[PDB]
Amino acid sequence: GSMMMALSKTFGQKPVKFQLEDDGEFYMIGSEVGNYLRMFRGSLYKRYPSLWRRLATVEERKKIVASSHGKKTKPNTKDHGYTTLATSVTLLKASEVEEILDGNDEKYKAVSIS
């Protein structure tokens, strides 16, 4: 008489989220989301066609690193920050990731499946 029921879609710390608009718009780096769900080879985008994804401008990336990131793990210095992930940063809708994280994303995986 043991009730079995457990869902596990997210793994690890939550992906890096940041604010891009003064209106409270928060986005997350798809790279983090991908590793978070362990999806590679664009599996996240290919698996979630209805998921909002876009590239960040040089200015956006700069704000992304400073706003989203700070010191990060591994050997880091105070005089310098990060100039590796500033080559290409994929932003995603915080609400989209949150839903998938909450387990709601059927419309994201199948575009709409109305």
Side-chain angles (χ1 to χ4, degrees):
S2 217
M3 54 111 115
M4 60 109 72
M5 205 223 245
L7 306 169
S8 37
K9 315 288 168 146
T10 88
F11 339 111
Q13 69 201 0
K14 173 92 107 305
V16 305
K17 53 148 116 50
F18 48 81
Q19 211 227 44
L20 255 187
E21 271 225 286
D22 236 33
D23 258 281
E25 240 165 291
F26 266 76
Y27 294 80
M28 292 225 242
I29 312 182
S31 309
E32 286 253 310
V33 186
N35 68 38
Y36 195 35
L37 299 123
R38 197 80 86 171
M39 301 248 253
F40 322 135
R41 302 185 71 79
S43 263
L44 206 96
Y45 299 130
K46 244 146 220 99
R47 185 104 144 165
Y48 286 97
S50 141
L51 207 73
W52 184 98
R53 64 104 197 197
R54 93 171 175 161
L55 274 122
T57 77
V58 188
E59 281 252 44
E60 280 185 301
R61 309 210 255 265
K62 268 138 99 144
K63 302 148 199 279
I64 287 154
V65 188
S67 80
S68 204
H69 305 137
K71 239 63 260 211
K72 276 211 186 157
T73 75
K74 269 220 291 142
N76 247 91
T77 42
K78 262 284 168 188
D79 261 301
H80 304 133
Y82 266 84
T83 320
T84 332
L85 79 315
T87 320
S88 30
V89 186
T90 42
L91 315 97
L92 265 90
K93 292 282 225 171
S95 333
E96 257 107 304
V97 187
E98 262 277 306
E99 300 262 66
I100 315 146
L101 290 197
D102 236 52
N104 185 84
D105 53 280
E106 277 219 32
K107 58 172 139 139
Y108 301 134
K109 346 197 66 243
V111 177
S112 200
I113 186 112
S114 48

